[PDB]
Amino acid sequence: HLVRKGTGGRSSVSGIIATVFGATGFLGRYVVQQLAKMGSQVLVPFRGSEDCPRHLKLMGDLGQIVPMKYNPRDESSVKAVMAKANVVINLIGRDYETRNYSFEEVHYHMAENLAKISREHGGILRFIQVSCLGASPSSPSRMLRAKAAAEEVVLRELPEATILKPAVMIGTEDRILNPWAHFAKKYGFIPLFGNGSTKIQPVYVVDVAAALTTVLKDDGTSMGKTYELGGPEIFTVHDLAELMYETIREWPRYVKVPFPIAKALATPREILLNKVPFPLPTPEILNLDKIQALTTDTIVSENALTFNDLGIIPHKLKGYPVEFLISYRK
Amino acid sequence: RSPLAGARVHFANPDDAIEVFVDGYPVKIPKGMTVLQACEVAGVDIPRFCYHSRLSIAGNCRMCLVEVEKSPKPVASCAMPALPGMKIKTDTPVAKKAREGVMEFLLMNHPLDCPICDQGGECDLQDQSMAFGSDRGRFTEVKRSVVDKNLGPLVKTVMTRCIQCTRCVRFATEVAGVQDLGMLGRGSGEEIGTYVEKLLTSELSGNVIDICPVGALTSKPFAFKARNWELKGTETIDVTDAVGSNIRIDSRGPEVMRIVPRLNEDINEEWISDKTRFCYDGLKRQRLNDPMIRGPDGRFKAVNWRDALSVIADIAHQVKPEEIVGVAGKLSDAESMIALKDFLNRMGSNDVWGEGIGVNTNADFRSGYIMNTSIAGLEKADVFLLVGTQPRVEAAMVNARIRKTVRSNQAKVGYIGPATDFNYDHKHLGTDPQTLVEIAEGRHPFFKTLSDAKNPVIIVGAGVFERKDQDAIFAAVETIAQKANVVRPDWNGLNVLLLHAAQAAALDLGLVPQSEKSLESAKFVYLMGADDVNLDKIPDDAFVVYQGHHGDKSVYRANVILPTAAFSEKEGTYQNTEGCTQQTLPAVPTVGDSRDDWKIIRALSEVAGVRLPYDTIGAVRARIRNVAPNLVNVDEREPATLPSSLRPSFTQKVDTTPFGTVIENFYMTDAITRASKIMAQCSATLL
Amino acid sequence: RGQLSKNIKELRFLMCQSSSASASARAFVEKNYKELKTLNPKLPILIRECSGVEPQLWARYDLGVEKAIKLEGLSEAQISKALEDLAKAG
Amino acid sequence: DNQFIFKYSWETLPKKWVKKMERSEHGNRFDTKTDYLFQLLCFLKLHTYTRVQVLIDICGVDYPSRKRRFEVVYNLLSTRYNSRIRVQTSADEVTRISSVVSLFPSAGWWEREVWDMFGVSFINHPDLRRILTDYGFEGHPLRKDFPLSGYVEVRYDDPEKRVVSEPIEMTQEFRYFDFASPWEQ
Amino acid sequence: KPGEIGMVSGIPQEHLRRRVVIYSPARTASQQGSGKVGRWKINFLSTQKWENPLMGWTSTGDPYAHVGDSALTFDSAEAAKAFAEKHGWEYSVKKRHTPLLKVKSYADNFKWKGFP
Amino acid sequence: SNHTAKWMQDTSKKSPMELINEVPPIKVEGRIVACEGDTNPALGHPIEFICLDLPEPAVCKYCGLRYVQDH
Amino acid sequence: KVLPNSASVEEARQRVFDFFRATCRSLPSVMEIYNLYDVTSVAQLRSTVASEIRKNIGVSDPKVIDMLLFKGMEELMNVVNHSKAISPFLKNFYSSNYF
Ligand SMILES: NC(=O)C1=CN([C@@H]2O[C@H](COP(=O)(O)OP(=O)(O)OC[C@H]3O[C@@H](n4cnc5c(N)ncnc54)[C@H](OP(=O)(O)O)[C@@H]3O)[C@@H](O)[C@H]2O)C=CC1
Ligand code: SF4
Ligand code: SF4
Ligand code: FES
């Protein structure tokens, strides 16, 4: 049992040692900040450059944020990283492929390895794994299918594991609103995909982090549950684009390219990546996996547990979450 | 010109007040009071090394020298009596030169080991040297050296630092009552201690290090742990004994570092017992810090306060309210005890009792169950009759005050009870309530002494409470009082010497058991830190919840364990045998997620069906005022004017069983004391 | 009178050592405590005296139900009648 | 030294406002009432034989025991006659004392500093905004009851992308060492 | 009014309602000097100190951890009560214990025992 | 032992306790000694005078060196 | 500009009214300063300011009233310059011992 030894805030104990795999990403910043604000110790395992977790160093007290260099393909290195861990958080996953890492390798195999190591190390009390909202075995997107398989194998190997399924997350370092704003500023228009009639439930990233913190603080009510996380109201892609354009105070402009030609445009990247030995530019917008995910709606199923069941209301996406887009005005 | 330290002068009679001049300003002083105290009244303090207010007078250090007019030589302030119209001066060049020379002579052989000396910043030699002595040293020859002495597991001795003030030689003679320490030798090199290897052993032996001005005698458990300036001192009281002696707890951070006495003329002048002084060590061992539940396998699993309270409430609701019993521990504040009583009563049970309370105890008279004479009255007493009590092992400060009275005026003290060793030449009258009845009937020379001796005192031990014939015992004692004029309109000599801190407050709140089979005919047991409740009596198929701070004896039987705060971590009201009620103060943070006793009682009540009407300690003390208003007058003694002679007697004869030793160790009596490693060492060595 | 223990679980008197208002309560508590404790032994009849508290009588019945009555302006007979009423109201 | 214009002032100054005077080698001292401080400083600045025409500084001292805890001290200098003088008054938290910005223009920043550190407000200050502490500071740091480490501390909050202010949670608490000797009195 | 000064002093409202203890620190038992007595202190009962996980230091979170013992020294209990009432926090004054002077004599040190 | 392991974790080099136990006692003819720390009094510790009537070696309490009387 | 202490309750009331006027006129500037237009409710902000003034009625000393108004004007300038069922007892009990 974790024991709290302080009032709270910075320079406390909170009795939690959380190893946050994938803490250098978009959500890693917020989850590590929340954990360090709790007063807990955060082990940040970083893959490559030594300056990747640099910012994560400043959000915790002295010695609370510990960066560890590892090899994701090294079981011994993963075990060494998870040696002092008390709870484990998994955020590892990339929106695209690379000649080294495919969708299956970056999500399913890594989730299986993390679950196996957590099961072997009996000191782990909580295992919170993050996937996508549309992660289903029948989902058209390969990445969504891989995340669904990863969540299934995490449940199978480690029943004492909570699975969060947030929808698309917007924030200062998001990968949808920022590319849309950059495209709008550079070319004066943004490409809608299948006339933008599909619907999503974008969710605020600090809200997702607070949801994860509440899941960690649960008194044993969510040991083996899956929590679907979404925004207050359903936004169509066109509505989200209009909100973005209103926030930047620019005139909206759309082309609404059809799905077949969009898939044709995004197709050559995969074959080129599998062929050439040098890396290709990452697809910020023209991503075949993003197209495949956009083929079907990604909203809450009304059956699985949501923000209301967890205990925190989602934030409306007009003014608090989109305040970062002001820097994009003029 | 206020007196030094705000001191109040005691005039034997207003007629006797001579006018003595100190530094030009005249003051009124009693006749026999000395020059040092004359200047103390005037408001100026004089350096002193071999003078203690409680101890006798000796001119060992010769440093309290002042210039009195019409006198060729400087006179010792601590010894010269004050005469009418005497012109005393302390700031003259003669006095300053005398002080400087005496300081130089004191420091000419003092070792240069202040940095390793544990008296850094609290050494009278250092402060008086920096205030009155010179800033240089003319001595550069060979010093003197003394080998160290082994004086027990409490007093570490570095005899090179001793200035031979004989303050501890006459302390063991006068206050402690055991004559082992002595000044043996002659000349510049004279040693102090025992000729043979004799570890000093006494209840007050801890005070020897306190009065040593230099770091010659120091607390061994606190050998080199910390300095003085680091420690923050909180003024609190002690719970190991029922004296309620005032203490100061010095702590450095989250842990208690030492315990020292503090002045309270009504309870303990400046002294402290070994158990009280060294009980701090047990506060860091075997300390419960998490609510726990005993699973089916018999091992404890740590759970949340919510889960623990929920399971306790469910089990309490499951059983019928008739077989529900509540036991208050040896140490417990009135807030926790009243909260426990209210919770159990609202659960439908009337079986709440405190530790050390008999089945049939007439707790309806405070004059019946407290020390009516008070400690000052014990000072004023002339003859003592100690029945069923051994003050040397319980209420060591009361024993010290009895010894002081015996020394001050020859008191014919008679003792009835088990064989024991005293230090004030007692007379062993007998070992039997039958002998007590003989004294009551009046066919006894000690009854004759009590009858023809003014100001008599009869002290009944609180171990009589556990007896079945306590009503007959108290009837006999009341007969003694009636036929010896012990209870007078201006003097009350009846006293009951309680031996537990929570006993007085428990009796005030009315925590008395209702049946003999109460503990062994109950299905739900609530042990409020009761580690001496005879766990084998409780049936095996009984749900036991132990609300405590140290895991000593009841944890192995409890089904649920609740961690709380000790006396040094909570603000709680206690009452002493004298009748004075006083509050402890929070010195150090609580250990783990342990809440207050009354706090967890109220939370458990709210979790259960019946919620206690109070949410703050202010409302708790309001409820305490409602039930017994004598516990809401902090540091105030409330006399009980109703006589104890109104209590009826139900047993017509006393039992033949002799008085037993209720306290067998004095070094392992409470939970903290038993958990104290240094006190265990003291029990092993000094017994 | 001899059946206080039938309903009352614990009786309490609270007064002052030398208050004028509590003067009438002291004789009552003396004599009546003697005679009742002669009658019913198991009943606690606790007596408490403070510096300035108003003279009052508390009766605690089962399930921890407390009823208090002020005795500041009642004579001995009135206090006895009030105690009998408290016993009967249990 | 140079106790000439001090004695001359006590000889010539009106006796109505001289509450008390101190003749010391540590500095000649005048203590007056807050009502007449402006008039007293105007007399000293303008008189031809006590020309303290330069204001050295204004200081505040906190005395929690006294009814009027704050003590406002004015150190002035006379370069023409080469001597320093001291004029002080007593003020509490709420009462406003007269300002001497009109006489000595340098007094504005010292009076703002006194406001900042203690809370003694001035009557005729052109402005009385805080000068030394952080924007939005809530307490008065130089009061004795004010804790040494303050009430709040700042840090960078990544989600807010700004430096936020939070209640103090500092590690390695201040260790107050009680060195005072019982024989010093 | 008892509390206006505190409510306008800028102290955070959460710290303006807390029980404090007003007491005169007693003389140290280690030494007999009486120059550190007669002063009165406000005892902010702030015991929330823990151990720093990295270096084992004594952390704290209460701003009033040491100010009452370090900076706030009052001339008298009346002054301390006035300060506490001005600043609004609840207070409880602890009675100070005072030594009692009695006549002592070296002649009584050498007393004569009675006849055998 | 416990104290050494509490302040040090190397447990590979020799702790100061072992070195100071390994240095032999210093035999002196006189009954009293002057313990200074090293050959230069100004670079050692405050002077400590040690009594040597007890048969066992006496620790200096500064730079503890265990002086022993000759006869 | 700072003014001498108010010698009358009517003068203190007039100063309070002037300060409330200043707050009301400076409210729309705070709108562009902070940009919380979604759930600001300028009317609710005015109501909250009035509620603060109304909870500060227990004060009766004109000096305290003037000091409070001075600090309120200072706070206004700072804001303009952009410087930011289990009963209550059981929740605190489950949280920590110090409550
Ligand atoms: N698009 C979105 O924002 C949404 C995402 N999700 C889910 O949440 C997960 C986390 O999202 P998010 O943090 O925002 O995205 P990121 O891609 O920014 O976070 C992943 C982190 O892991 C690292 N990483 C990436 N690939 C590997 C690899 N092969 N081996 C080791 N480390 C790797 C990343 O870079 P580095 O190596 O430099 O540390 C980064 O630090 C996603 O994978 C997805 O399943 C759910 C809803 C919306
Ligand atoms: S008592 Fe002596 S050895 Fe100890 S510090 Fe003081 S002057 Fe030095
Ligand atoms: S050991 Fe201490 S108290 Fe005893 S004579 Fe020596 S200096 Fe005095
Ligand atoms: S104190 Fe008087 S001679 Fe020592």
Ligand SMILES: [Zn+2]
């Ligand atoms: Zn040495």
